[PDB]
């Protein structure tokens, strides 16, 4: 009907400021079903019941129209002030450049684009709220056989500045004119081609070729996985799983990111605005599903080529090497094709993460540097593969893949602490920037314990190998720091990265006041799953960096790795939801762009 249409063209952050068409329909239906029968009753009581119901309905309409008009006036004042500011800024910039550049002009163009998008969203809100108001009043009129409905409509709704003001329309026209003149030297077409606003959020569908390709890649993937299982069961192996564990984690991750983006699109957790992508065009969930499926096809094919031996000229150790060489070349492809805009956004982001303490920390660069705390197994397996191919590989006999173990020399500890270091120094940069110690240093005191845990694990491993007597006290220190860097991380997650256990639970017990994901068992299952998978993950870390007996010293590492990429997949939902929820209380919908 329409109650769905209000949930596909609504801008998510302005939720409570919209109509309450859902609640109005509930009120109407409940009053109708509750309204007793007059045929078995008197007249005065039932007609007074109708009267009081009408009065309550009208008071609710009063409050609703007042709220809508106030919010729209506030947003119009804000947009007018922002347009005045940006116009003065453009004027001053033009005068300065005439009296006396690319990075300035591009940012100015983008600021104008974001302002036009804010205007479009305000206009859409106006139109949708008016439509919902009209529909919910016509329904009441039809169900209560009353004529005063449209009378009071034309009296009060058809006069309010909520829709009887065309300032937004003339501002849109003025913005169009000013951009196409100043920033374009005429040629309205090349300006409008980017000023246009296609449907955003859950409204945009897939090009249907992307859904076909998702299907094709998932089908080939399923058949190759079944072929893999069958080949492995019918037709040592540790350097062959310790090399494809990296690819497995990186396929699982860019699918659980596809699932995450679908969850965000549906639930209304605006990730577009939070990451600061551009809201006109971005990657929906199917594009991530398709990238994950393609890289999974490549992984399965390389694994199969290792299992069988199709070509007798190419030795086996070229298959994983070629798979990862591809993966990297696909990521670093310089020609403008195969997701070029997206790969180069991601590459600039990865650079800004990896040289951390210099650039100002946004949100994408501490979502990614915090999500790289789950692919430490990928980094360790890549370090191990490099160690293999450069120090131990037989390089001959076409068997060197299936024939760098006592890593306690001080390399595996560092390559496992490197993402913890990235995030620690990012938080220190955030502190230097904000000059607020909380939360920016209590959070550094969460990643600063990973260093201590891994260092004590390595030292206890070395001392148990030696045979000293202080191995007991080192093991005790390690178990203390394990308990810490587990309970610290768990409390921190549940209390600041998701926001749960707030002072204002109320009906939503153990949760914040407003929850975006519909069913309330989700958060409880996630709480329990995180409490379990945050433990045993520090176990996996301390075990991949020790001298435990390789049997059951590595099976645990390869079992708990894709069971922790899952923990991160679950954590993503609620981190991004809590962030959206802190932007759904400031009524923000457009990435403030800062002219130069």
**Residue 224 contacts a second copy per CB under 8 A:** yes
Enumerate residues preceding breaks in the chain (C to N > 2.5 Å): 100, 235, 403
The whole-angstrom separation of Cα 28 and Cα 54 is: 10
Residue 367: partners with Cβ closer than 8 Å, 6 or more residues away: 275, 575, 576
Q: Which of 40, 154, 208, 549 binds a second copy (CB under 8 A)?
A: 208
The whole-angstrom separation of Cα 452 and Cα 477 is: 9
Q: Which of 223, 232, 555, 596 binds a second copy (CB under 8 A)?
A: 223
Q: CB-wise, 87 or 266, nearer to a second copy?
A: 266
Q: Which stretch binds a second copy (CB under 8 A): 39-47, 219-227, 345-353, 538-546?
A: 219-227
**Residue 368 contacts a second copy per CB under 8 A:** no
Coil vs helix vs strand at 381: helix
Q: Which stretch binds a second copy (CB under 8 A): 170-178, 222-230, 260-268, 515-523?
A: 222-230
**Residue 214 contacts a second copy per CB under 8 A:** yes
State the minimum distance, in angstroms, from the CB of residue 220 to a second copy. Answer: 4
**Residue 327 contacts a second copy per CB under 8 A:** no
Residue where the block lists tokens 């076409």: 398
Classify residue 334 by burial, with Cβ atoms within 10 Å: 0-12, 13-18, 19+. exposed
The whole-angstrom separation of Cα 244 and Cα 246 is: 5
Binding mask 106-145 for a second copy (x = CB under 8 A): ----------------------------------------
**Would you list which residues are annotated within the binding site for phosphate?**
370, 373, 446-447, 534, 567-568
**Would you list which residues are annotated within the binding site?**
370, 373, 446-447, 534, 567-568
Q: Which residues ranging from 540 to 569 are in contact with a second copy (CB under 8 A)?
A: none
**Residue 222 contacts a second copy per CB under 8 A:** yes
Query: Which has the closest alpha carbon to 496: 562, 417, 427?
Result: 427
Q: CB-wise, 215 or 362, nearer to a second copy?
A: 215
Rg (CA), the chain: 30
The whole-angstrom separation of Cα 67 and Cα 19 is: 9
Coil vs helix vs strand at 504: coil
Binding mask 1-30 for a second copy (x = CB under 8 A): ------------------------------
Q: CB-wise, 290 or 370, nearer to a second copy?
A: 290
Number of Cβ atoms within 10 Å of the Cβ of 212: 13
State the minimum distance, in angstroms, from the CB of residue 153 to a second copy. Answer: 23
For the stretch 525-539, what's the b/e string if a residue is b when 16 or more beta carbons lie within 10 angstroms of its beta carbon?
A: ebbeebeebbebbbe
Q: What is the DSSP letter of 194?
A: H
Q: CB-wise, 212 or 329, nearer to a second copy?
A: 212
- Say if residues 538 and 508 touch (Cβ distance below 8 Å): no
Binding mask 149-188 for a second copy (x = CB under 8 A): ----------------------------------------
Q: Which stretch binds a second copy (CB under 8 A): 90-98, 208-216, 469-477, 581-589?
A: 208-216
**Residue 212 contacts a second copy per CB under 8 A:** yes
**Residue 301 contacts a second copy per CB under 8 A:** no
Q: Which of 183, 218, 350, 536 binds a second copy (CB under 8 A)?
A: 218
CA angle 334, 339, 345 (to 5 degrees): 75
- Say if residues 128 and 18 touch (Cβ distance below 8 Å): yes
Residue 150: partners with Cβ closer than 8 Å, 6 or more residues away: 137, 141
State the minimum distance, in angstroms, from the CB of residue 212 to a second copy. Answer: 4
State the minimum distance, in angstroms, from the CB of residue 285 to a second copy. Answer: 12
The whole-angstrom separation of Cα 301 and Cα 78 is: 56
**Residue 228 contacts a second copy per CB under 8 A:** no
**Residue 317 contacts a second copy per CB under 8 A:** no
Q: CB-wise, 84 or 222, nearer to a second copy?
A: 222
- Say if residues 285 and 261 touch (Cβ distance below 8 Å): yes
**Residue 205 contacts a second copy per CB under 8 A:** yes
* Torsion sign, CA atoms 386, 390, 394, 395: positive
**Residue 338 contacts a second copy per CB under 8 A:** no
Q: Within 13 A of 214's CA, how many CA atoms are on the CB side?
A: 14
Q: Which stretch binds a second copy (CB under 8 A): 77-85, 211-219, 522-530, 562-570?
A: 211-219
**Residue 199 contacts a second copy per CB under 8 A:** no
**Residue 192 contacts a second copy per CB under 8 A:** no
**Residue 216 contacts a second copy per CB under 8 A:** yes
- Say if residues 533 and 566 touch (Cβ distance below 8 Å): yes
Q: Which residues ranging from 376 to 415 are in contact with a second copy (CB under 8 A)?
A: none
Q: How many residues at the interface with a second copy, by CB under 8 A?
A: 18
Q: Which of 161, 219, 410, 553 binds a second copy (CB under 8 A)?
A: 219
- Say if residues 299 and 253 touch (Cβ distance below 8 Å): no
Most distant CA atoms of the chain, gap in Å: 101
Which residues of the shown chain bind a second copy in the complex (CB under 8 A)?
205-206, 208, 211-224, 227
């Amino acid at each position: 009907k329409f109650a769905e249409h209000l949930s596909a063209h609504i801008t998510p952050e302005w939720r409570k400021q919209y109509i309450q068409y859902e609640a109005f329909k509930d009120m109407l239906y409940s009053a109708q079903d509750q309204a007793p029968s007059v045929e078995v009753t008197d007249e005065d009581t039932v007609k007074r019941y109708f009267a009081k119901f009408e009065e309550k309905f009208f008071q609710t309409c009063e409050k609703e129209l007042a709220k809508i008009n106030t919010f729209y006036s506030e947003k119009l004042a804000e947009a007018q002030r922002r347009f005045a500011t940006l116009q003065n800024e453009l004027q001053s910039s033009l005068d300065a450049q005439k009296e006396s550049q690319h990075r300035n002009i591009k940012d100015l163009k983008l600021a104008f684009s974001e302002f036009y998008l804010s205007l479009i969203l305000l206009q859409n809100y106006q139109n949708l709220n008016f439509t919902g108001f009209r529909k919910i009043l016509k329904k009441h009129d039809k169900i209560l056989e009353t004529s005063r409905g449209a009378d009071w409509r034309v009296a009060h709704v058809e006069v309010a500045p909520f829709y009887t003001c065309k300032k937004i329309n003339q501002l849109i026209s003025e913005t169009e004119a000013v951009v196409t003149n100043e920033l374009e030297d005429g040629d309205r077409q090349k300006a409008m081609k980017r000023l246009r606003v296609p449907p955003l959020g859950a409204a945009q569908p897939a090009p249907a070729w992307t859904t076909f390709r998702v299907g094709l890649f998932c089908g080939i993937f399923i058949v190759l996985n079944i072929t893999l299982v069958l080949a492995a069961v019918f037709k040592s192996i540790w350097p062959l799983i310790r090399i494809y564990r990296g690819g497995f984690l990186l396929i699982e991750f860019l699918f659980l990111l596809g699932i995450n983006t679908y969850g965000w699109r549906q639930a209304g957790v605006n990730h577009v605005l939070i990451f600061e992508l551009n809201p006109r065009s971005n990657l929906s969930h199917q594009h991530l599903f398709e990238i994950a499926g393609f890289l999974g096809i490549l992984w399965c094919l390389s694994l199969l080529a290792c299992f069988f031996a199709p070509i007798s000229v190419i030795p086996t150790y070229v298959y994983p090497l070629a798979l990862y060489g591809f993966m990297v070349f696909f990521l670093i492809n310089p020609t403008k094709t195969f997701y070029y805009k997206s790969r180069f956004w991601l590459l600039k982001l990865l650079f800004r993460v990896f040289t951390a303490p210099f650039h100002k920390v946004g949100f994408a660069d501490f979502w990614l540097a915090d999500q790289l705390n789950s692919l430490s197994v990928i980094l360790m397996d890549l370090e191990y593969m490099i160690c293999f191919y450069s120090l131990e590989l037989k390089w001959d006999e076409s068997k060197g893949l299936l024939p760098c173990h006592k890593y306690t020399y001080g390399v595996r500890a560092i390559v496992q602490c490197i993402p913890a270091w990235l995030r620690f120094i990012q938080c220190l940069r955030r502190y230097r920037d904000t000059k607020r110690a909380f939360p920016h240093l209590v959070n550094a005191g969460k990643y600063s314990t990973t260093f201590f845990m891994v260092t004590f694990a390595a030292l206890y491993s070395t001392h148990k190998e030696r045979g000293h007597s202080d191995t007991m006290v080192f093991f005790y220190l390690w178990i203390v720091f394990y308990i810490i860097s587990s309970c610290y991380t768990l409390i921190w997650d549940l209390k600041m990265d998701w926001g749960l256990f707030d002072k204002n639970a109320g009906e939503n017990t153990f949760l914040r006041e407003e929850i975006v994901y519909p069913q309330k068992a989700y958060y409880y299952c996630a709480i329990i799953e995180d409490v379990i998978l945050r433990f045993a993950w520090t176990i996996q870390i301390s075990i991949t960096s020790t001298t435990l007996l390789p049997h059951s010293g590595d099976i645990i590492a390869t079992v708990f790795a894709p069971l922790e990429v899952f923990r991160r997949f679950v954590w993503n939902f609620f981190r991004l939801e809590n962030e959206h929820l802190n932007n759904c209380a400031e009524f923000r919908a457009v990435r403030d762009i800062s002219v130069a």
